[PDB]
C-alpha cells in the first residue's frame, strides 16, 4: 500500500496566470532504473480521467507544454503556466512502483474571474405534471460567479421554506461561471390555493435580489 | 484512435450479481493489461482488479476491498475484459471504469446496489410564463444516471445540466439551455432523456405556453 496526498482544493487562479498542484507519497516513487513513477490525471467536469504527465515530468501526447511536472521520490509539482477556462477539473496523482495501484484524492482547479450577476428564469408548472396531480415551480440562476448565492421562494408574498430542492453546477468549463437551480414541488391541489409565484436571487453583485415572479 | 468502451451496468440487489464488460479498439488487445477502477463520491478512484497477459498465464489481482466477490477475465479473440461481481454491497456502487494502466480509460459504466425499485423518469417542459431560457424537468427516476440533450444532441451551446438531487428514494434533474428569441419558437427545441435502467427514450417538444 502507497498513500498519494493532496490537497481537494486550490487558491481560485486567475485566467492567464500560473496554477500550482501538489502531491506527496508515503513511500519513494524513484526506482532503480532512474524513473520516478509518478503520474497526473485530469478529469474534466462530466469527462473520464485522461493521462496528463508520465514517469513524473513527460507530457503525454497533445497536451499543451503550459503542463508540465517536477519532483524528488516523494514529493512533487504540477505547474499550469497560463491557466485556461478548459483547464478547470480534477487533478489526481498516482503512482506505478506496486499493486495495489493507488490514487490521491484530487484537487480540484478553480478559475477565478469577474464578478458576474446571475441570470434568473422562472418557470411555472407544466400541463403535463398538473395531469398527473403535481405542480414543480422551477427558478434558474445561470451563468453567475462567485459560486455562492441565495435563493428564496414566495407565495403570495410570504416567505416559503419547505418543498425546495437546489443543485448546484460545476464550474463551467468555457465560461468560468456557475449556476443554480432552484425547485418548488408542490401538489396540484396546493398549488391551486395560490396564485403568486416569486423566486428570489440573492448575490454579492447587487445589495437588492433579482426578483422573478409569475401569477397562476 | 484507441477507444475504450465499457458496458452491462444497471441496478442490482444487495447480495446480488452483475457482470459487466468492456471492448478495446484501435490497439492490439491482448498485448495490454487490463484493470477496473471504480469512482464514488466518497471513497474517491479505486483500482479493484487486473489482469495480465497470456503469456502471463493470465495471472489476476484484486483490491482487498472486494477480494473473494470479485472475478476479472478476458477474450482476447473479441477484444473483451470482464468484470464479474458477486454479493455485490451497497458500498460498491460507482461507475465502473477499464483502464489500460496506464494510459488509457473508458467511459464509464453505472452500477448501483440497492433495494430500491427502477423508475422511469417523467420529463416535462418548462417554457417561459435578445435571448430566451428553456428547459426540461426530469422527475422521480431511479437508479442514475439519466442523459439529456438538445435536438438530439446537436445544440449542444447555451447547454447545462443540473445535478440530481436524490429525495425518498427518486432523482429529480433539470437541464437549461439559453437560446436567441429568433431560433424560439419559430424553430423547434426539444429535449432527449435516456433513462437505460428502465429502457426509456422520452423527447419532449418545448412549445410556448
Known amino acids: 500500500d502507497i498513500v498519494m496526498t493532496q490537497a481537494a482544493f486550490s487558491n481560485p487562479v486567475t485566467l492567464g496566470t500560473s496554477a500550482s498542484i501538489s502531491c506527496r507519497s508515503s513511500?519513494?516513487?524513484?526506482?532503480?532504473?532512474?524513473?520516478?513513477?509518478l503520474y497526473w490525471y485530469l478529469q474534466k467536469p462530466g469527462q473520464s480521467p485522461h493521462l496528463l504527465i508520465y514517469?513524473?515530468?513527460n507530457l503525454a501526447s497533445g497536451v499543451p507544454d503550459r503542463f508540465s511536472s517536477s519532483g524528488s521520490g516523494t514529493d512533487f509539482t504540477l505547474r499550469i503556466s497560463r491557466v485556461e477556462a478548459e483547464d478547470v477539473g480534477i487533478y489526481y496523482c498516482?503512482?506505478?512502483?506496486?499493486?495495489?495501484?493507488?490514487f490521491g484524492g484530487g484537487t480540484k482547479l478553480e478559475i477565478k474571474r469577474a464578478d458576474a450577476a446571475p441570470t434568473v428564469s422562472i418557470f411555472p408548472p407544466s400541463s403535463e405534471q398538473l395531469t398527473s396531480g403535481g405542480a414543480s415551480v422551477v427558478c434558474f440562476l445561470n451563468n453567475f460567479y462567485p459560486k455562492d448565492i441565495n435563493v428564496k421562494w414566495k407565495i403570495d408574498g410570504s416567505e416559503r421554506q419547505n418543498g425546495v430542492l437546489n443543485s448546484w453546477t460545476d464550474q463551467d468549463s468555457k465560461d468560468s461561471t456557475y449556476s443554480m437551480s432552484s425547485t418548488l414541488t408542490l401538489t396540484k391541489d396546493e398549488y391551486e390555493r395560490h396564485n403568486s409565484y416569486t423566486c428570489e436571487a440573492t448575490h454579492k453583485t447587487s445589495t437588492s435580489p433579482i426578483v422573478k415572479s409569475f401569477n397562476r | 484512435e484507441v477507444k475504450v468502451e465499457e458496458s452491462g451496468g444497471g441496478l442490482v440487489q444487495p447480495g446480488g450479481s452483475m457482470k459487466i464488460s468492456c471492448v478495446v479498439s484501435?490497439?492490439?488487445?491482448?498485448?495490454?493489461?487490463m484493470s477496473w477502477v471504480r469512482q464514488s463520491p466518497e471513497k474517491g478512484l479505486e483500482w479493484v482488479a487486473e489482469?495480465?497477459?497470456?503469456?502471463?498465464?493470465?495471472?489476476?489481482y484484486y483490491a482487498e476491498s472486494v477480494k473473494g466477490k470479485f472475478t476479472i477475465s478476458r477474450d482476447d479473440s473479441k477484444s473483451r475484459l470482464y468484470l464479474q461481481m458477486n454479493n455485490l454491497r451497497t458500498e460498491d456502487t460507482g461507475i465502473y471504469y477499464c483502464?489500460?494502466?496506464?494510459?488509457?480509460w473508458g467511459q464509464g459504466t453505472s452500477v448501483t446496489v440497492s433495494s430500491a425499485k427502477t423508475t422511469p423518469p417523467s420529463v416535462y417542459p418548462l417554457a417561459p410564463g435578445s435571448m430566451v431560457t428553456l428547459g426540461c424537468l426530469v422527475k422521480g427516476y431511479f437508479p442514475e444516471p439519466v442523459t439529456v440533450t438538445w435536438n438530439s444532441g446537436s445544440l449542444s451551446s447555451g447547454v447545462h445540466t443540473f445535478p440530481a438531487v436524490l429525495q425518498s428514494d427518486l432523482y429529480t434533474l433539470s437541464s437549461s439551455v439559453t437560446v436567441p428569441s429568433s431560433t424560439w419558437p419559430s424553430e423547434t427545441v426539444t429535449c432527449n432523456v435516456a433513462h437505460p435502467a428502465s429502457s426509456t427514450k422520452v423527447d419532449k417538444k418545448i412549445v410556448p405556453r
Open positions: 514517469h513524473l515530468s
Open positions: 489482469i495480465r497477459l497470456k503469456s502471463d498465464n493470465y495471472a489476476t
Open positions: 498516482a503512482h506505478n512502483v506496486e499493486l495495489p495501484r493507488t
Open positions: 483502464f489500460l494502466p496506464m494510459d488509457y
Open positions: 513511500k519513494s516513487l524513484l526506482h532503480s532504473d532512474g524513473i520516478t513513477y
Open positions: 484501435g490497439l492490439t488487445f491482448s498485448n495490454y493489461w
